[PDB]
Amino acid sequence: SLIAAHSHITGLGLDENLQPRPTSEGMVGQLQARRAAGVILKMVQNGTIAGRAVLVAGPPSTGKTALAMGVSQSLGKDVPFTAIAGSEIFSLELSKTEALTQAFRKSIGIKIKEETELIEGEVVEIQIDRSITGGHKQGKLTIKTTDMETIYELGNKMIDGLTKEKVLAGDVISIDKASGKITKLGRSFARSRDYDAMGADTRFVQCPEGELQKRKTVVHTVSLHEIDVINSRTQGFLALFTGDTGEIRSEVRDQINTKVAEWKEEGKAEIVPGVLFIDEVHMLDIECFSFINRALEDEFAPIVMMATNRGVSKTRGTNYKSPHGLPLDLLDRSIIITTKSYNEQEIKTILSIRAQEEEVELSSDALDLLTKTGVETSLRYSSNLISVAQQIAMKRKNNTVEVEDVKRAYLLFLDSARSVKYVQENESQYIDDQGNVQISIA
Amino acid sequence: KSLSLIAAHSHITGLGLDENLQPRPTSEGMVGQLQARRAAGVILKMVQNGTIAGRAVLVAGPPSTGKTALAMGVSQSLGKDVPFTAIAGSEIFSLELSKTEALTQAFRKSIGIKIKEETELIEGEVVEIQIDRSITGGHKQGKLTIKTTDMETIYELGNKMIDGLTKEKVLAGDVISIDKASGKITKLGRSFARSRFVQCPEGELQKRKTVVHTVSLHEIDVINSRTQGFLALFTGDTGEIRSEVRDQINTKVAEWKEEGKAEIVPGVLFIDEVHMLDIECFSFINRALEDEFAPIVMMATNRGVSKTRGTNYKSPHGLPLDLLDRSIIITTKSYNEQEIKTILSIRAQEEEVELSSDALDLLTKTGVETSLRYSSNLISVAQQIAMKRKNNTVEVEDVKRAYLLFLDSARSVKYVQENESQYIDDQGNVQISIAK
Amino acid sequence: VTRTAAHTHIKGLGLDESGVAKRVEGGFVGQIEAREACGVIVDLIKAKKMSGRAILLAGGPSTGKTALALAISQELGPKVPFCPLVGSELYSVEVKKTETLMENFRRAIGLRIKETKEVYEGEVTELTPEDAENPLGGYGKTISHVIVGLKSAKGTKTLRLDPTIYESIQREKVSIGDVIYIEANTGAVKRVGRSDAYATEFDLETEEYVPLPKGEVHKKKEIVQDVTLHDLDVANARPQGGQDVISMMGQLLKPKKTEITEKLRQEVNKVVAKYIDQGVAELIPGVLFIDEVNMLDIEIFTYLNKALESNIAPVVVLASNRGMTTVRGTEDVISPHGVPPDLIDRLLIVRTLPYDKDEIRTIIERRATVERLQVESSALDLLATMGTETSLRYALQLLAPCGILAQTSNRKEIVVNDVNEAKLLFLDAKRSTKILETSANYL
Amino acid sequence: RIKETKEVYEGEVTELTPEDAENPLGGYGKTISHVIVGLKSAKGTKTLRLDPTIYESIQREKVSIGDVIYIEANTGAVKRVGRSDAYATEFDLETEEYVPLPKGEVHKKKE
Amino acid sequence: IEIDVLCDLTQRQAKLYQVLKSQISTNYDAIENAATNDNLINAVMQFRKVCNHPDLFERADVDSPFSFTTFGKTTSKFTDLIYSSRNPIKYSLPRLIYEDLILPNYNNDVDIANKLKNVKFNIFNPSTNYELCLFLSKLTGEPSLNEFFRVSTTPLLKRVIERTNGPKNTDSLSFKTITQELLEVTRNAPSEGVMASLLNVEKHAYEREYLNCIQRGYHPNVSAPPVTIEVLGSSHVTNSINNELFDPLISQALSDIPAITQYNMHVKKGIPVEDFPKTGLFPEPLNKNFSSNISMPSMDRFITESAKLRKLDELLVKLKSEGHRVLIYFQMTKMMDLMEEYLTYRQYNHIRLDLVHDWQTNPEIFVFLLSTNLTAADTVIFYDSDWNPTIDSQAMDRATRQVTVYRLLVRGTIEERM
Amino acid sequence: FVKPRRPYNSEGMTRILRRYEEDLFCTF
Ligand SMILES: Nc1ncnc2c1ncn2[C@@H]1O[C@H](COP(=O)(O)OP(=O)(O)O)[C@@H](O)[C@H]1O
Ligand SMILES: Nc1ncnc2c1ncn2[C@@H]1O[C@H](COP(=O)(O)OP(=O)(O)O)[C@@H](O)[C@H]1O
Ligand SMILES: Nc1ncnc2c1ncn2[C@@H]1O[C@H](COP(=O)(O)OP(=O)(O)O)[C@@H](O)[C@H]1O
């Protein structure tokens, strides 16, 4: 596939006693934050408590989003992990509180137990009866296995699934009752008189033997928000994909909560809560914070993880300054995991891991110079330089990045400090904040 | 009819006035404010005369001086079949209507048209119903016997009456009302025959009855515009009705009044908290008052010299001077001890609370000291404390307990001002920890 | 076993029969005068006589205002409607804030009606339509009548339908051999399922098989329903439920909040009063709870001043943690608790108090015994000193990481060392701010 | 970038005959056992045995003799490209779209 | 052998318990004191009725929206069933407004102005603006030059009903978008094709998550017809309102024609299929459960709503597998009827209400119900358990093998104190 | 005993028969 920014992190790298290894599972260093994230991971996996807010704070390029991705990969399958940014709340058709309510309800999964029946066998005779216009449809199907042969009755959807994906006599099909899905497995009769209309080359499969009808228990996970969108109006299943779910009323949410509790009380369904991750949470209005402070106190509330790389700055919607850009009421009900800057050995290990993921054979001195330029400049610049150095290296037709290609890539592409150094001595060439510029060279 | 628990102005049944427009000291639930009640009586006579239009008055004074009480007194003294629209200043800031359009709709809702029409009706108690079918059932014959307390008759039915009787089942002994020209038949109930329950009608069975209709200009404005039906009067999305239909409605109403088929009944529009309107609303209100079909506008405000909204300067009452030039101002004053205790006794009578004399004196003292509304809220909350000790009369101890439990304005400011480290200030700083 | 979130150790105010609060009752510790005032408010609400009464819960953070409102709702019971709300909910992009406030006002008033339903039900035996003499005449439909024969346990009736009921019957996709349910108030048809009198193992449509309904075909049954006034207003403004084309096309459109006029509200009130006069309905007024009331604008406060003077208004409970604070939407109006002085006159303020060290310790005790955790005495004293030093809430939610760290060492005891590790791994606001000040690049 | 293999059948309609069954069922008329359709293109002519169920597709798209059609292999689902160019002078006044006769064979596989 | 079984309260039982607790002004201490002592007895009978079975306190019935209607009801060889539902809210209109603004007569100009604004001064009229019509026909490709005048003068609903897929000439400026030639391929395309599967995400998500077997969770509280408009003394208003509410084109478009009626059109009357009034335009619901707002009382919720009943349904499987004869002790006769209907639903062998003779002679029976003499009696259950030992002792020695006595207990109620 | 099957009710409707050897299509 393709290579992403955190593609080397699949897990958190923790032992059975929640103690981090120095270099494991794509993560190196940051022992205290990894231990705290493992504690939060087990807190999610217990599923006994709700509505706890966790704040991750630190300087930029430290591993906050890396920690969130490690938590998400250690979470495992069929557990909801909603990852949003702070800028997506502001919408033209939804209120901020409604968007936050939907983002909260996306992170709660409901695991529904269902009982199905599977039917497989050769088709003997299909009879389909239709109206003159074509609306009313009914018919009988004669399916057959080696031992048994029964006749069934068909409805509108079953005939629709029979007509598309064309079934003739002699084909072997598999029917699932609760899902309404018809799959053709192949053909067995090999009919001689074939009207040459299609270019079918259907597979030769064997006769299915044994019981015609078999029962099985299936499990699927649905979200809470999907249940509100489905029950909201007549065609809500389209609105699940088009996003045209405009301000679902409170009565729907109350009745859905009551029916979810009723399904839990019988054993059909169980509640699997998840993690809602809000990156750049400081990019939020104070009304959003006031809603979050009281939406964290509900029964159906996920564990909320927030990330900030901001100090004592202005809180949006107000005219005062607060720590992390957040009001003190939200900071009262949050526990805070802090993150610290890196060393030279950690930066070298990060660059070696990212070179192993991107399949680049780096030399020793090239790695030393990349570590040097990653400890003077930032880590992300030296991480970005590796692919460019590789593409320069294949121009000379050798599959090993030397220090010459790294030096050429450092010459061709600039850092932020070199850019501000070049800008600040040529201020007439660039457009001023007052809009003045010099275009003529003489 | 008109379900209501107890309102805050539920004791005001009108303006207490004589036949020479002189205010009695205590009448119709209103005490004090003699000059303001006389001015409101003059305005009431202006409305009831109906020969002048588009005059704006302003009721200004300190808070809790009876401005909304005066407006409720005028509204109760008008009675029914006269339009009275009461809006707030923040109601017109709509997301689907412009401000001038909302003001125009509120203006035309306050003037109505009195139309008198007569219809011929059938009322009686059903004695016996026969439906006959043929061999094929193509035609249906029928006979209906219906009576009142004075006559009895038998009618031969046709096909559409038989279909209208089979639908909405009608059996013997039912009292029904039949409209012949429209075919609508309503079941009034069941007669008193043990062998719902209403009595058998009296008099004639074919009655010509006159019904006096009153319809506002905004309703005919909505119906005459083809862009929406009459269901927009209930759903509320009319959506910026065009002007040309309003000139058609104006000309049609003028020729209806000329021919004699209709009468014009002007009413009162009341704008509470008028200082929360923008200057564009004030400028529209200035020029909307010179129309021929304009009601009498009552505005109430309690500000001093404050900033006009949408501007950067300050004006008296929060209103610009060009709006104040076309207004006559009624001024309300503060209350005495005796007026406060009479108000509290009337609020005791309306809340069905029996008070001791000492409890009334303590309530009067704490009402002069703090607020009239604070004592008028304390009186109903003292009765529950009295009823927890299982006695009917409210004594002094219940009033002191309620005064201890529930705070007022000045006391709450006083406890806040020396505990401000525990509250969140304007800068968002607070101390939650007990120590350090 | 169960799931707990920041509450549900509170089961009520915990008063006596005379209104006197005990020290530890209903999960409450302290706050005696606030609980007694809330009990007086509960008695006032249960009296069912007052309209437009407003109280304000004023105190600092973490002093128990939302807990008191939850205790009010639990003491009143599930029959009385309780409408929790935050101040940021009123800012909607579909309709103005005034209409949202009035919608919540009408949503806070309940009703209880006993309704009679005319019901036809049974298993469909014969379904035969009759045709029209000129079906392409432009006016009039294709068929004239449909004969439906229904049978029940000890009963069989044959009905002749007009086409309009048959259109709903056809939309329900009924056939011969199905158990149906026709109600005559709105013409709605419910198809229950296949009758059990035939074979049940020859279908592919995952349908369930019911037996014949008992009794006759034509019944009149009594149903007790609990509705609000906002439900009546919403059902009248967007009409669905009839069998006319406006009603069927009303279900297919996307729903949207409109500005409900006052005329519809007066007519709904008149109909409800006529229902109450017949001994059919009864009125249950309720409580509207608005949290973070300082988030409202000056226009919403000015509309609340008029909405509280109505004759059908519920009891409104507000809460705020603000001192001398400018009101939002104004630039110079400094008022107590961020609430303008025109609203404070129509209010009764209930003041909440901060806690003591022993109250913090026993609150941590109930929160530990609700989360199914056992702690030591020295760890409890450390947690109480920690709650006094930093915050009550920080001591409250440090319990679960302590329990996880106790579980991962194969013990069922929370000790001092686990609390020290929870201090080392998780910070509070003060230590994070102290890190932020002594930092190079906003660490 | 998506690649796909198409099996097609296009050309001018030569004949269009719904073949009847040997033993028809009672209560019905014209029980089709199969449909014979003859195609004509440039340097090519081929008749086809088809499903009975494409007769409704013939009747919906109003396919008659002299039209040039487009038969997809697997789904059936015929469609009318237009009228053949040899019938352009059939009627003085008409409102139709006459398309040239298609080139190449009737049956072809194109990626 | 004496063992007690603890049960946990359900949602409906806890709701009724909280309603009963809030109703009696919270004298729960007095209720506990006079429960230890044994008109408070009538108060605690409601509590024991709630913990016994929620249907005894209030019977579960058909859950439907409240009908805000005034229809024709019966105040009690076929029966006529005609739709007659109205709205209780009546909007009254005078005859003068209708007859002088909405209907044409000699003294107004509704028809004249309608013709002037819609026919003579219309810009799509080919008798006056032929150049614009020819320009638009070159632009779009419509074979008729009266198509634009027909589109601009009929409503959107009437346009979208009778819309046909007529052909257009190729020599025009309107060609086909990329999205349209993607969508037109997969109209009848089968599965396993790459282009067909890449454009069919929604149906795969439908059958991946089993969306045709889910249950409906929300139904509205009140359902109402539109507001009735009343004009006294005018049949024209009634005709117009009945034509608008029950437009035959539109109501015919939202449903079907019966199949035998279609056979009577096509074969017995010679009407072609293209002359049919077009049908079947109502959208299909998600499930069969989402097609209506009426929910049924099911005999699976009856088990789960009572915790003691669910614990009996859990416990009788072991006794049936071990082959015993069970007997239940009660205190009322209402739950005697309740266990009659439950056991007939569960088709078990029980008594119909001599008893000792039928007990000894017939071993095919399973479960005995008595209201306060057996030997082959092995397992006995106390449902409505009362710890007055006089009744329990006589119940014990009223009924060879080992004897197990069971008691059902509900957590957090009166019986945990008891 | 054996329960009877549900009655099948198709008059005035077309039919598509898909057998092993040969397919029909009956039209009106
Ligand atoms: N402990 C770590 N293990 C693996 N990769 C890391 C680690 N710390 C940082 N990184 C890398 O450094 C980058 C840090 O950026 P990011 O986490 O997105 O923002 P921030 O560090 O400001 O939260 C990521 O691309 C990540 O791949
Ligand atoms: N003159 C009066 N007679 C009777 N009641 C009065 C009078 N003046 C004020 N009140 C009562 O005092 C209460 C508060 O007065 P209100 O009219 O709300 O003050 P404002 O004029 O500021 O709106 C109201 O319930 C009103 O009924
Ligand atoms: N008297 C009390 N007894 C037990 N727990 C309390 C008490 N007061 C507050 N709490 C707890 O302390 C927290 C205070 O939260 P909340 O009341 O929402 O904030 P505020 O006090 O600002 O309204 C809640 O989690 C509540 O459970």
Contact status, residue B366 vs residue B395, Cβ threshold 8 Å = no
- CA A89 to ligand 1 centroid distance, Å: 25
Query: What is the rounded CA–CA span in Å between residue C260 and residue C246?
Result: 19
Q: Where are the beta strands (DSSP E) in E372-418?
A: 379-382, 404-410
Query: What is the rounded CA–CA span in Å between residue C373 and residue B248?
Result: 78
List chains touching F (3+ CB pairs under 8 A): A, C, D, E
Angle at F11 between CA F5 and CA F12, to 5 degrees: 155
Residue with tokens 């050995």: A345
Which tokens hold the place of A229? Answer: 């969108």
Pair type for strands B140-147 and B152-157 = antiparallel
Per-residue burial over C346-378, b if 16 or more Cβ lie within 10 Å, else e, is: bbbbbbbbbbeeebbbbbbbebbebbebebeee
Which tokens hold the place of B387? Answer: 């009823």
* Residue E237 vs residues A181, C239, C377, E230: alpha-carbon distances, Å: 52, 21, 83, 8
At residue C91, φ and ψ (nearest 5 deg) are -95, 95
C323: Cα separation from own chain's centroid? 31
Query: What is the rounded CA–CA span in Å between residue B130 and residue A405?
Result: 108
Angle at A247 between CA A245 and CA A251, to 5 degrees: 110
The amino acid occupying position E85 is S
Query: What is the rounded CA–CA span in Å between residue A68 and residue A40?
Result: 11
| Radius of gyration from C-alpha coordinates of chain D | 16
Query: What letter would DSSP give residue E100?
Result: I
Q: Residue C239 is nearest to which of E224, E275, E283, comparing CB atoms?
A: E224
- Helix, strand, or coil (residue C53): coil
Residue numbers in C near B309 (CB within 8 A): none
At residue C69, φ and ψ (nearest 5 deg) are -65, -40
Residue numbers in F near E262 (CB within 8 A): 12
List chains touching E (3+ CB pairs under 8 A): A, B, C, D, F
Q: How many CB atoms lie within 10 A of CB A219?
A: 11
Between positions 172 and 231 of A, the ones with CB within 8 A of E are 178-181, 183, 218, 220, 222, 227, 230-231
Going by C-alpha positions, the residue among C117, B233, C242 that lies closest to residue E225 is: C242
Query: What letter would DSSP give residue E157?
Result: H
Query: What is the rounded CA–CA span in Å between residue A3 and residue A23?
Result: 21
Contact state of A315 with B428 under an 8 Å Cβ cutoff: yes
Query: What is the rounded CA–CA span in Å between residue A234 and residue A248?
Result: 13
Which residues 6+ apart lie within 8 Å of E192 measured at CB?
Answer: none
Query: Which residue minimizes the CA distance to atom 23 of ligand 2?
Result: B68
Q: Residue B436 is nearest to which of C51, C309, C389, comparing CB atoms?
A: C389
The C-alpha torsion from C260 through C262 and C263 to C269, rounded to 10°, is 100
Q: How many CB atoms lie within 10 A of CB B135?
A: 5
Which ligand has an atom closest to residue A337 CA?
Answer: 1
C436: Cα separation from own chain's centroid? 42
- Helix, strand, or coil (residue E406): strand
Going by C-alpha positions, the residue among C254, A78, A227, C191 that lies closest to residue E215 is: A227
Length of chain D: 111
The amino acid occupying position B143 is K
Query: What is the rounded CA–CA span in Å between residue B208 and residue E92?
Result: 18
Query: What is the rounded CA–CA span in Å between residue E68 and residue E87?
Result: 7
- For B35-42, the CB contacts below 8 A with 24+ separation are B35/B331, B36/B66, B36/B70, B36/B330, B36/B331, B36/B332, B36/B333, B37/B70, B37/B73, B39/B330, B40/B15, B40/B70, B40/B73, B40/B74, B40/B330, B41/B15, B41/B17
Going by C-alpha positions, the residue among B66, B62, B52 that lies closest to residue B23 is: B66
Contact status, residue C300 vs residue C94, Cβ threshold 8 Å = no
Q: Is B305 on the interface with C (CB under 8 A)?
A: no
Residue with tokens 């996306």: A106
D11: Cα separation from own chain's centroid? 7
Contact status, residue C337 vs residue C365, Cβ threshold 8 Å = no
Q: Is D30 on the interface with F (CB under 8 A)?
A: yes
Query: What is the rounded CA–CA span in Å between residue F19 and residue A119?
Result: 20
Q: Is A329 on the interface with B (CB under 8 A)?
A: yes
Going by C-alpha positions, the residue among E418, E408, E385, E389 that lies closest to residue E35 is: E418
E135: Cα separation from own chain's centroid? 54
Query: What is the rounded CA–CA span in Å between residue A141 and residue A128?
Result: 8
Which residues 6+ apart lie within 8 Å of B120 measured at CB?
Answer: B180, B181, B206, B207, B208, B209, E233
Residue numbers in D near F27 (CB within 8 A): 28-32, 55
C59 is in an annotated binding site: yes
- Helix, strand, or coil (residue D99): strand
Q: Where are the beta strands (DSSP E) in E69-207?
A: 79-81, 90-92
C307: Cα separation from own chain's centroid? 21
Bind-site residues of B? 61-68
How far A241 CA sits from the closest chain E CA (Å)? 8
Which residues 6+ apart lie within 8 Å of A20 measured at CB?
Answer: A12, A13, A14, A27, A30, A31, A34, A35, A38
Contact status, residue B180 vs residue B161, Cβ threshold 8 Å = no
Contact status, residue A335 vs residue C394, Cβ threshold 8 Å = yes
E327: Cα separation from own chain's centroid? 39
How far E396 CA sits from the closest chain C CA (Å)? 36
- Helix, strand, or coil (residue E5): strand
B25 lines ligand 2 (CB under 6 A): no
With touching defined as 3+ CB pairs under 8 A, do chains F and B touch? no
Query: Which residue minimizes the CA distance to atom 23 of ligand 1?
Result: A64
Q: How many CB atoms lie within 10 A of CB C191?
A: 21
Contact status, residue A147 vs residue A210, Cβ threshold 8 Å = yes
* Residue B397 vs residues B373, B385, B389, C41, E198: alpha-carbon distances, Å: 20, 9, 11, 18, 80
Going by C-alpha positions, the residue among A288, A243, B237 that lies closest to residue C95 is: B237
Query: What is the rounded CA–CA span in Å between residue A104 and residue A109?
Result: 11
C320 lines ligand 3 (CB under 6 A): no
Contact state of A59 with C440 under an 8 Å Cβ cutoff: yes
- CA C403 to ligand 3 centroid distance, Å: 22
Which tokens hold the place of E225? Answer: 């017809």
Contact state of E95 with B187 under an 8 Å Cβ cutoff: no
C197: Cα separation from own chain's centroid? 43
- Side-chain half-sphere CA neighbours of E168 within 13 A: 17
The C-alpha torsion from E250 through E291 and C122 to C148, rounded to 10°, is 20
* Residue B272 vs residues B78, B80, B86, B332, E16: alpha-carbon distances, Å: 18, 21, 7, 15, 45
Which tokens hold the place of B389? Answer: 């000790």
Give the N- to C-terminal CA distance of chain A in Å, as an integer.
52
At residue B274, φ and ψ (nearest 5 deg) are -75, -15
Length of chain E: 418
Going by C-alpha positions, the residue among E218, E17, E69 that lies closest to residue C113 is: E69
Task: Convert chain B into a string of H (helix), E (strand) and C (coil).
Answer: CCCCCCCCCCCCCCCCECCCCCECCEECCEECCHHHHHHHHHHHHHHHHCCCCCCEEEEECCCCCCHHHHHHHHHHHHCCCCCEEEEECCCCCCCCCCHHHHHHHHHHCCEEEEEEEEEEEEEEEEEEEEEEECCCCCCEEEEEEEECCCCEEEEEECHHHHHHHHCCCCCCCEEEEEECCCCCEEEEEECCCCCCECCCCCCCCEEEEEEEEEEEHHHHHHHHCCCCCCCHHHHCCCCCCCCHHHHHHHHHHHHHHHHCCCEEEECEEEEECHHHCCHHHHHHHHHHCCCCCCCEEEEEECCCEEECCCCCCEEECCCCHHHHCCEEEEECCCCCHHHHHHHHHHHHHHCCCCECHHHHHHHHHHHHHCCHHHHHHHHHHHHHHHHHCCCCCECHHHHHHHHHHCECHHHHHHHHHCCCCCCCCCCCCCCCCCCC
Q: Partners of A303 in the beta sheet?
A: A275
Residue numbers in E near F14 (CB within 8 A): none
At residue D69, φ and ψ (nearest 5 deg) are -120, -175
Which residues 6+ apart lie within 8 Å of E113 measured at CB?
Answer: none
Length of chain B: 436
Query: What letter would DSSP give residue C241?
Result: B
- Helix, strand, or coil (residue C382): helix
- CA A62 to ligand 1 centroid distance, Å: 5
How far E304 CA sits from the closest chain A CA (Å)? 6
Contact status, residue B117 vs residue B173, Cβ threshold 8 Å = no
Q: Is D59 on the interface with F (CB under 8 A)?
A: no
Q: Residue E261 is nearest to which of C15, C142, C160, comparing CB atoms?
A: C142
- Helix, strand, or coil (residue C190): strand
Q: At what angle do helices C229-237 and C262-277 cross, to 10 degrees?
A: 130
Q: For residue D55, what is the nearest residue in chain F, using CA coordinates?
A: F25
Which residues 6+ apart lie within 8 Å of B128 measured at CB?
Answer: B144, B145, B172
Pair type for strands E222-223 and E66-67 = parallel
Q: Where are the beta strands (DSSP E) in C188-286?
A: 189-195, 209-210, 218-228, 281-285
Contact status, residue B408 vs residue C351, Cβ threshold 8 Å = no
Residue with tokens 């709006």: B323
Q: For residue F8, what is the nearest residue in chain C, using CA coordinates?
A: C176
Q: Is B299 exposed, middle or buried (0-12, 13-18, 19+ CB in 10 A)?
A: buried
Query: What is the rounded CA–CA span in Å between residue A206 and residue A214?
Result: 18
Contact state of A165 with E219 under an 8 Å Cβ cutoff: no
Query: What letter would DSSP give residue C56?
Result: E
Query: What letter would DSSP give residue C223?
Result: E
Which tokens hold the place of B261? Answer: 């088929």
Contact state of E262 with F12 under an 8 Å Cβ cutoff: yes
Going by C-alpha positions, the residue among C416, C327, C333, C329 that lies closest to residue C376 is: C416
E110: Cα separation from own chain's centroid? 47
Task: Convert chain A into a string of H (helix), E (strand) and C (coil).
Answer: CCCCCCCCCCCCCECCCCCECCEECCEECCHHHHHHHHHHHHHHHHCCECCCEEEEECCCCCCHHHHHHHHHHHHCCCCCEEEEEHHHCCCCCCCHHHHHHHHHHCCEEEEEEEEEEEEEEEEEEEEEEECCCCCCEEEEEEEECCCCEEEEEECHHHHHHHHCCCCCCCEEEEEECCCCEEEEEEECCCCCCCCCCCCCCCCECCCCCCCCEEEEEEEEEEEHHHHHHHHHCCCHHHHHHHCCCCCCCHHHHHHHHHHHHHHHHHCCEEEEECEEEEECCCCCCHHHHHHHHHHCCCCCCCEEEEEECCCCEECCCCCCEEHHHCCHHHHHCEEEEECCCCCHHHHHHHHHHHHHHCCCCECHHHHHHHHHHHHHCCHHHHHHHHHHHHHHHHHHCCCCECHHHHHHHHHHCCCHHHHHHHHHCCCCCCCCCCCCCCCCCC
- CA B40 to ligand 2 centroid distance, Å: 15
- Solved how? cryo-EM
Query: What is the rounded CA–CA span in Å between residue C328 and residue C345?
Result: 19
C214: Cα separation from own chain's centroid? 36
Contact status, residue C262 vs residue E250, Cβ threshold 8 Å = no
CA dihedral over E11, E14, E15, E16, signed as positive or negative: positive
Query: What is the rounded CA–CA span in Å between residue C5 and residue E307?
Result: 25
Contact status, residue A273 vs residue A50, Cβ threshold 8 Å = yes
Contact status, residue A310 vs residue A324, Cβ threshold 8 Å = yes
Contact state of C136 with E68 under an 8 Å Cβ cutoff: no
Q: Is A327 on the interface with B (CB under 8 A)?
A: yes
Resolution in angstrom units? 2.8
Q: Is B402 exposed, middle or buried (0-12, 13-18, 19+ CB in 10 A)?
A: buried
